[PDB]
Amino acid sequence: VTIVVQGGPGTLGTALQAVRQGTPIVVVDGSGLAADVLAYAYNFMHNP
Amino acid sequence: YYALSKNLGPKLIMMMEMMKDVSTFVFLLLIFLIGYGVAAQSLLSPDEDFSSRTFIGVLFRPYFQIYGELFLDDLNSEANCLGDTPFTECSRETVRMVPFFLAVYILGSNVLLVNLLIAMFNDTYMKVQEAAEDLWRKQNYELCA
Amino acid sequence: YYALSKNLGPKLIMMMEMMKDVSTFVFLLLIFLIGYGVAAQSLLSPDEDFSSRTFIGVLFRPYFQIYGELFLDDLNSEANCLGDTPFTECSRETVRMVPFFLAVYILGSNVLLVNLLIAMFNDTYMKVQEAAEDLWRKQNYELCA
Amino acid sequence: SVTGGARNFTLPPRLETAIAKGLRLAAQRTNAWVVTGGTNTGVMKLTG
Amino acid sequence: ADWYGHLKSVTSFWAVLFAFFFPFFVLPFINFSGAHRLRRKFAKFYSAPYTRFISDLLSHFVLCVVTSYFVLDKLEDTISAIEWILLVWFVALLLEELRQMIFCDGIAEYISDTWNRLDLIMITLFFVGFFTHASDPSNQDSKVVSKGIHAFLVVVLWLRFMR
Amino acid sequence: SLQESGIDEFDDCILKAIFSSQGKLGNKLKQAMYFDQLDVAKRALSEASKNGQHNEIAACINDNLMAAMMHNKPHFVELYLGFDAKIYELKPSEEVAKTNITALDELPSFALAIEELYKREAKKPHSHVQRLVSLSNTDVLGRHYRVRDLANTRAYNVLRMDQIFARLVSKDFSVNRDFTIYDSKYDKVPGIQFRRTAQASHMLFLWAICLDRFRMARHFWLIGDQSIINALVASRILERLSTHRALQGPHLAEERAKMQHNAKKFEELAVGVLGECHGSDSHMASEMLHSKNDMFNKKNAINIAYDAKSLAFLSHPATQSVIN
Amino acid sequence: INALVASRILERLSTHRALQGPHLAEERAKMQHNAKKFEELAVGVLGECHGSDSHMASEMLHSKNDMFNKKNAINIAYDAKSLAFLSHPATQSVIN
Amino acid sequence: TTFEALNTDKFLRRWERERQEMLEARVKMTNDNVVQAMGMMDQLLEHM
Amino acid sequence: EYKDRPFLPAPFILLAHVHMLFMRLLRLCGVHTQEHEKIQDDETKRKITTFEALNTDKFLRRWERERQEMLEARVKMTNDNVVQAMGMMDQLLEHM
Ligand SMILES: Nc1ncnc2c1ncn2[C@@H]1O[C@H](COP(=O)(O)OP(=O)(O)OC[C@H]2O[C@@H](O)[C@H](O)[C@@H]2O)[C@@H](O)[C@H]1O
Ligand SMILES: CC(C)CCC[C@@H](C)[C@H]1CC[C@H]2[C@@H]3CC=C4C[C@@H](O)CC[C@]4(C)[C@H]3CC[C@]12C
Ligand SMILES: CC(C)CCC[C@@H](C)[C@H]1CC[C@H]2[C@@H]3CC=C4C[C@@H](O)CC[C@]4(C)[C@H]3CC[C@]12C
Ligand SMILES: CC(C)CCC[C@@H](C)[C@H]1CC[C@H]2[C@@H]3CC=C4C[C@@H](O)CC[C@]4(C)[C@H]3CC[C@]12C
Ligand SMILES: CC(C)CCC[C@@H](C)[C@H]1CC[C@H]2[C@@H]3CC=C4C[C@@H](O)CC[C@]4(C)[C@H]3CC[C@]12C
Ligand SMILES: CC(C)CCC[C@@H](C)[C@H]1CC[C@H]2[C@@H]3CC=C4C[C@@H](O)CC[C@]4(C)[C@H]3CC[C@]12C
Ligand SMILES: CC(C)CCC[C@@H](C)[C@H]1CC[C@H]2[C@@H]3CC=C4C[C@@H](O)CC[C@]4(C)[C@H]3CC[C@]12C
Ligand SMILES: [Mg+2]
């Protein structure tokens, strides 16, 4: 289980190689920089 | 004629249901009485023939020694022990246990069975006094009938 | 043979668990007894040699003065104080504290430790009487066994 | 695995104690092997 | 754990009383929680506060029995050796009460207990009774007044024995 | 969401990311047992039983019982039973060494897991288990007055604690075990999958009468048979655990009062099964109370309750109907 | 009248001669509990008769019964030995 | 033994029914069913 | 009381006082042999204060869970959640 707390470009690279190697991720929304990007992308794509 | 008043009317029914615990205390008391009476009348009077006077001697002093009247001057005159101290220089040495059995008896009776009767009379007065006015109204109807 | 009836059967188990509080009252009572006995036998008889009669004098009258039998005529004859008032014109002035210690003793024992034993016997009869019928049914099984 | 921004970490203390209390109870109850970045700046310093 | 000390938890009253009265039978009792083994055994046995409590009980019971035999018997024309033993005894209790006076948290913390007031009362009335008897030993009335003070002494000795 | 959710939803979202990964079902149920979410793991096993998978569940749940007995979760061991739990196939964490004993070599590999649970129970400081074995003064096979490395590393075996409970009831228990039942050759007989859990559940019931755990002893009392006799044995073992000789200080007293409270709950359970036996067929209940027991030296259950000293079982009207 | 007959029949069922053992005692205590419920019901109907027209309730308690040998309901309650029916204020108004 | 096992199951069903007839478990299941009713009501609003 | 006593009984406690006066004359005076004292470490007392703070937070979380397990707070949150359910239900009607 990988937890993304705020982050930058290399944090999105570790999230990219976490998802592309099948490791599930936890993104905490409302925290900051890249976690709002990942939460906005998942809430745009899959949230009904 | 005490059933007209609201106080004395439940106190009669309380006195009858206390007299049942008195008969319970009779069945608890007669064992210690007759046992200390046969033992004390044997230790005071050895080599004496059986009569009705021995039966008065097993009924008289045990019963009245639980109410506070200790007969130690009369037991000292009865055991024929002479001295300023009441039991040192007796003729026989078996009468010096006549206080000692008496000690065990009043520890059987004066402080033990009597305070058991205060405990049963407290539970008896609670079992009457939670339901007193219904017994008074029943006796008011029995006065009318 | 009292275990067949539903009344006397818990009263035996109540009498044994009251006899444990009797032994507790023995351990509380022996301090005041032996202390007033050594003090009163020293104040009544000065310049007297120790024997078994002194040990009868420290065990006999303290024990029987807590049950109501006060020996004040025998203490007045023992202290050799002469008068219509029992303690005014004595030979020695230290025997006039022989009632006074006695006053403190019965305030130690006759009104204090005995009423502590009524309080422990009330709690003992409550701890028996909330669970009496299970003890009676257990003794009915022990009669059958 | 914990990932995050190293030198751009700037959070309020209430949210930092909330993430720290959740990660402390998760690391206490989990007995897990925590893989972070190795450097002493930011969220790896906080996880250490 | 401060009360038992190095004695674990499984000890009776009669076990520590029999090991107090027989120091050579203490050793078979295993050590709970060559020369240094047995010595550290009676060092950790006699360093416990429970052994000090049973030593002060039994020693105050030996006092109350010995002063009961002192007060109930007749006094002599001279000072007897049992009165000398009670004088040296109560000096040792007077040095123990001054030892508890200096090694305390205060004067009021010492005197706020009932037992320290009572033990001073019995030390004060024993020195008043012994100076009453030893002011004039060859008089009967001084023995009468001294046995009258010693009656109050043996009453408050039995009343201290409740501690 | 950090500020829009609660503080106790973060363990739910880590456990939801744990259940998002597939293929690690024993470690997924282990982190479900660590995060104490019972209904989420019940929904996971219900979705796995609905989808038709059973072989990953039957691999996972034996180590999940072992970890749930080791970490004291009673609702999880209530939950994993009913899903073909198979209590007798438990395996320990480590391997027991050879001790050159013919009785200890016949133990069928779950008794070492019971001894591993006893060794994990005795590893806590100020435990009553280690002081009770140290005040037992017995051998490794449980023989009285026979007091080694074997007797120290294998000091908490199940036969020694069986002899401690056999002395803890009375002087006439004489507990029997049959470890030659647990074999692959005795498979053609029908009812033995009853018997191979039930005595085995009784062994874990004795571990759950040692550690003052009421819910797990109630659940293994539910699984095993002879419920009245084992409830009165449970009340006698907790009533002799409530004094013994090590629980005599002032620092254990509410703990030993807790022992009295558990003892009272099992004797209420014994009355309640006999209350159901007073509900219907009381002549059959009178034949049950007159029936002899093979777990004692041929005495019936009223003599077992008198040796237990149980007042509520003697005051029942069916027992008083047999006595009257 | 049927509630006081119910309390008297359950109060004589609570002893009789067959319910004397230790094995029936909670059962006979159950008999006492039912008996108490019907005597509460008798008080409650008379409580409704103390709610309105108490002179008509006094004529009801003075009325003779054909189910007995011409005795009124206070004598029926005394033969029932019912303490709660005798302690009601309408019955005590008739007695007073 | 089968009569004892059937009476054990009848006692545990009757004790489960009597344990759910207490006031504490009734107030507890009333509280949790009102919380689940607010969750299903929040699903009804979001659907409206 | 009995932590600070010298052990030897009353008759012989004067010999222990002479021994205590000899240790008072030798030690904490001139010609002292040895004096013994002990001081706790800072990391051990820091472990005590962090253990005390973690047990304070575990007690206040357990006392908050036990205070919400009482019947009064359960009836109170049941009442306020039913009032909030009627407010969300009034939003559902107005939406219908
Ligand atoms: N691990 C690091 N330590 C120190 N400095 C770093 C690191 N990674 C990047 N930097 C530099 O510090 C600056 C701050 O960038 P941040 O956004 O704070 O960190 P980020 O770029 O997200 O680095 C992510 C890195 O951290 C780990 O969690 C993860 O493994 C990833 O490699 C960046 O411009 C970068 O050049
Ligand atoms: C359990 C308790 C109440 C015992 C009951 C006391 C009865 C049995 C005893 C106690 C005292 C006894 C009396 C004592 C003295 C006398 C005088 C004698 O000339 C005839 C017998 C007579 C009259 C006794 C009769 C029986 C008696 C009343
Ligand atoms: C265990 C207990 C109950 C034993 C019972 C004690 C009785 C039976 C025994 C023990 C001591 C005995 C006494 C010892 C000495 C004497 C002195 C002798 O000149 C007369 C008999 C007399 C007075 C004995 C009477 C009987 C006696 C009191
Ligand atoms: C368990 C209980 C009953 C113990 C019994 C105590 C017995 C053994 C003791 C207690 C008091 C004792 C008596 C006290 C004094 C004397 C006077 C002496 O000159 C002869 C023996 C005699 C008469 C004793 C006999 C034995 C005696 C009765
Ligand atoms: C705490 C209370 C119960 C004290 C116990 C009382 C005992 C120890 C005392 C009280 C009265 C005493 C008795 C009083 C009188 C005598 C007669 C004498 O010739 C021998 C001793 C003897 C027989 C005593 C024996 C001991 C005795 C029974
Ligand atoms: C705290 C309590 C114990 C106070 C003690 C009271 C003492 C000091 C008092 C109370 C009663 C007093 C006694 C009363 C009367 C007399 C008679 C007189 O001719 C000589 C003194 C003498 C014998 C007194 C001595 C002192 C005395 C014993
Ligand atoms: C504070 C209290 C307890 C002090 C104790 C009081 C005792 C120890 C003292 C106080 C007063 C004293 C008494 C005062 C006067 C007399 C008269 C004398 O001819 C004989 C002694 C006698 C009778 C004394 C005996 C001892 C005595 C009673
Ligand atoms: Mg002191």
Q: What does the H/E/C string look like for chain F?
A: CCCCCCCCCHHHHHHHHHHHCCCCHHHHHHHHHHHCCHHHHHHHHHHHHHHCCCHHHHHHHHHHHHHHHHCCCHHHHHHHCCCCCCHHHCCCCCCCCCCCCCCCCCCCCCHHHHHHHHHHHCCCCCCHHHHHHHCCCECCCCCECCCCCHHHHCCCCHHHHHHHHHHHHCCCCCCCCCCCCCCCCCCCCCCHHHHHHHHHHHHHHHHCCCCCCHHHHHHHHHHCCCHHHHHHHHHHHHHHHCCCCCCCCHHHHHHHHHHHHHHHHHHHHHHHHHHHHCCCCHHHHHHHHCCCCCCCCCCCHHHHHHHHCCHHHHCCHHHHHHHC
Strands (E) across chain C are located at none
Write out the two tokens for B109: 């009776």
Chains in contact with chain A (at least 3 beta-carbon pairs closer than 8 A): D, F
Instruction: Assign E42 to helix, strand or coil.
Output: helix
Do B24 and B44 touch, CB atoms closer than 8 A? Answer: no
Q: Which residue, among E57, E59, E160, would best test binding to I if mutated, counting the most I CBs under 10 Å from its CB?
A: E59
Instruction: Assign G66 to helix, strand or coil.
Output: coil
Q: Of F115, F121, F100, which is closest to residue F162 (Cα–Cα)? A: F115
Q: How far apart are CA D34 and CA E96, in angstroms?
A: 64
The ligand whose atoms approach the alpha carbon of E110 most closely is 8
The ligand whose atoms approach the alpha carbon of B99 most closely is 5
Q: How far apart are CA F301 and CA F293, in angstroms?
A: 8
**Which strand ranges, in their side-by-side order, compose the sheet holding A2-5?**
A25-27, A2-5, D2-4
Write out the two tokens for I14: 């004067």
Residue F31's CB: how many other CB atoms inside 10 A?
23
End-to-end CA distance of chain F, in Å?
Answer: 71
- From residue I35, alpha-carbon distances to C68, E47, E99, I29, I31 in Å are 64, 19, 21, 11, 12
Cα(F21) to centroid(ligand 1), Å: 27
CA angle F72, F77, F83 (to 5 degrees): 160
Instruction: Assign I72 to helix, strand or coil.
Output: helix
Q: How far apart are CA G52 and CA G57, in angstroms?
A: 9
Residue C5: in which H helix or E strand, if any? none
**Which of H4, H11, H14 is facing F288, going by the closest CB pair?**
H4
Write out the two tokens for F293: 């027991």
The C-alpha of A8 sits at a distance from chain F's nearest C-alpha, in angstroms, of 19
DSSP state of I7: S
Q: Of F270, F173, F168, which is closest to residue F210 (Cα–Cα)? A: F168
Q: How far apart are CA F168 and CA F161, in angstroms?
A: 10
Q: How far apart are CA F197 and CA F193, in angstroms?
A: 6
Q: How far apart are CA E72 and CA E39, in angstroms?
A: 43
* Residues in chain A closer than 8 A to F20 (CB atoms): 24
Do B68 and C66 touch, CB atoms closer than 8 A? Answer: no
Ligand 7: which of E152, E155, E156 to mutate, judged by most atoms within 8 Å of the beta carbon?
Answer: E152
Write out the two tokens for F168: 């803890």
Residue E89's CB: how many other CB atoms inside 10 A?
22
Which residue's C-alpha comes closest to atom 21 of ligand 7? E145
Contacts 24+ apart (CB under 8 A), F126-130: F128/F241, F128/F246, F128/F247, F128/F252, F129/F156, F129/F210, F129/F211
**Which of H3, H4, H15 is facing F272, going by the closest CB pair?**
H15
Do H4 and F288 touch, CB atoms closer than 8 A? Answer: yes
DSSP state of B95: G
Q: Which residue, among E51, E99, E109, would best test binding to I if mutated, counting the most I CBs under 10 Å from its CB?
A: E99
In this complex, is the C-beta atom of C59 within 8 Å of any C-beta atom belonging to chain E? no
CB within 8 Å: E92 and I2:
no
Phi–psi pair at B50, nearest 5 degrees: -80, 135
Q: How far apart are CA F319 and CA C107, in angstroms?
A: 53
* Residues in chain C closer than 8 A to E144 (CB atoms): 46, 92, 94
End-to-end CA distance of chain B, in Å?
Answer: 14
- From residue F242, alpha-carbon distances to F117, F169, F238, G70 in Å are 22, 13, 6, 67
Count, residues in chain A: 48
CA angle F296, F300, F304 (to 5 degrees): 65
Q: How far apart are CA C45 and CA E73, in angstroms?
A: 10
Residue type for E161, please? Answer: F
Ligand 6: which of C85, C100, C105 to mutate, judged by most atoms within 8 Å of the beta carbon?
Answer: C100
Phi–psi pair at E61, nearest 5 degrees: -75, -35
B64 lines ligand 4 (CB under 6 A): no
Cα(E143) to centroid(ligand 7), Å: 13
Do F65 and F78 touch, CB atoms closer than 8 A? Answer: no
Do E2 and E40 touch, CB atoms closer than 8 A? Answer: no
CB within 8 Å: E9 and F248:
yes
CA angle I50, I53, I54 (to 5 degrees): 85
F222 is in an annotated binding site: yes
F296 φ/ψ sector (left φ>0, alpha ψ -120 to 50, else beta): beta
Angle, helix G73-80 to helix G2-13, in steps of 10 degrees = 10
* Residues in chain D closer than 8 A to A23 (CB atoms): 1
The ligand whose atoms approach the alpha carbon of I1 most closely is 8
CA-atom Rg of chain D in angstroms: 11
Instruction: Assign D3 to helix, strand or coil.
Output: strand
Residue A3: in which H helix or E strand, if any? strand A2-5
Q: Of F229, F225, F227, F199, which is closest to residue F304 (Cα–Cα)? A: F229
Cα(C20) to centroid(ligand 4), Å: 22
In this complex, is the C-beta atom of F179 within 8 Å of any C-beta atom belonging to chain D? no
CB burial readout B67-78, b (16+ within 10 A) else e: eeebebeebbeb
Residue C102's CB: how many other CB atoms inside 10 A?
20
Q: How far apart are CA D16 and CA F3, in angstroms?
A: 12
* Pairs of CB atoms within 8 A across C/F: 21
Cα(C101) to centroid(ligand 6), Å: 10
DSSP state of C110: I
Residue type for F259, please? Answer: M
Write out the two tokens for E60: 């105050």
Contacts 24+ apart (CB under 8 A), E60-68: E60/E160, E60/E161, E60/I10, E61/E161, E63/E89, E63/E157, E63/I10, E64/E154, E64/E157, E64/E158, E64/E161, E67/E150, E67/E153, E67/E154, E67/E157, E68/C34, E68/C38, E68/E154
Residue I24's CB: how many other CB atoms inside 10 A?
11
Chains in contact with chain I (at least 3 beta-carbon pairs closer than 8 A): E, H
Cα(C45) to centroid(ligand 6), Å: 19
Q: How far apart are CA F32 and CA F68, in angstroms?
A: 11
Do B25 and B49 touch, CB atoms closer than 8 A? Answer: no
In this complex, is the C-beta atom of F31 within 8 Å of any C-beta atom belonging to chain D? yes
Count, residues in chain I: 96
Residue E3's CB: how many other CB atoms inside 10 A?
13
The C-alpha of E73 sits at a distance from chain C's nearest C-alpha, in angstroms, of 5
Do E157 and C38 touch, CB atoms closer than 8 A? Answer: no
Q: Solved how?
A: cryo-EM
Breaks (C-N over 2.5 A) in chain G follow: none
Q: How far apart are CA H38 and CA E106, in angstroms?
A: 66
Q: How far apart are CA D37 and CA D27, in angstroms?
A: 17
Cα(C90) to centroid(ligand 6), Å: 15
Q: How far apart are CA H48 and CA I96, in angstroms?
A: 8
Q: How far apart are CA I49 and CA I52, in angstroms?
A: 5
Contacts 24+ apart (CB under 8 A), C30-35: C31/E158, C31/E159, C31/E161, C31/E162, C32/C62, C32/C105, C32/C108, C32/C109, C32/C113, C32/E158, C33/C59, C33/C62, C33/C63, C33/C109, C34/C58, C34/C62, C34/E68, C34/E158, C35/E154, C35/E155, C35/E157, C35/E158, C35/E159
Write out the two tokens for I11: 């008759």
F221 is in an annotated binding site: yes
The C-alpha of D40 sits at a distance from chain A's nearest C-alpha, in angstroms, of 15
Q: Which residues face A2 on adjacent strands?
A: A25
Do F10 and A31 touch, CB atoms closer than 8 A? Answer: no
Tell me which chain A residue has its CA closest to the CA of residue D10.
A32
Residues of F with CB under 8 A from a CB of H: 222, 225-228, 272-273, 275-277, 279-281, 284, 288
CB burial readout E93-111, b (16+ within 10 A) else e: bbbbeebbeeeeeeeeebe
Q: How far apart are CA A45 and CA A39, in angstroms?
A: 10
3-state helix, strand, coil in chain I (%, to 5): 70, 0, 30
Q: Strand D2-4 relative to strand A25-27: parallel, antiparallel, unpaired?
A: unpaired
Q: Torsion over CA of A20, A21, A27 and A33, rounded to 10 degrees?
A: -60
Judged on CB neighbours under 10 Å (0-12, 13-18, 19+), F291 is exposed
Count, residues in chain G: 96
In this complex, is the C-beta atom of F21 within 8 Å of any C-beta atom belonging to chain D? no
Q: How far apart are CA F172 and CA F236, in angstroms?
A: 13
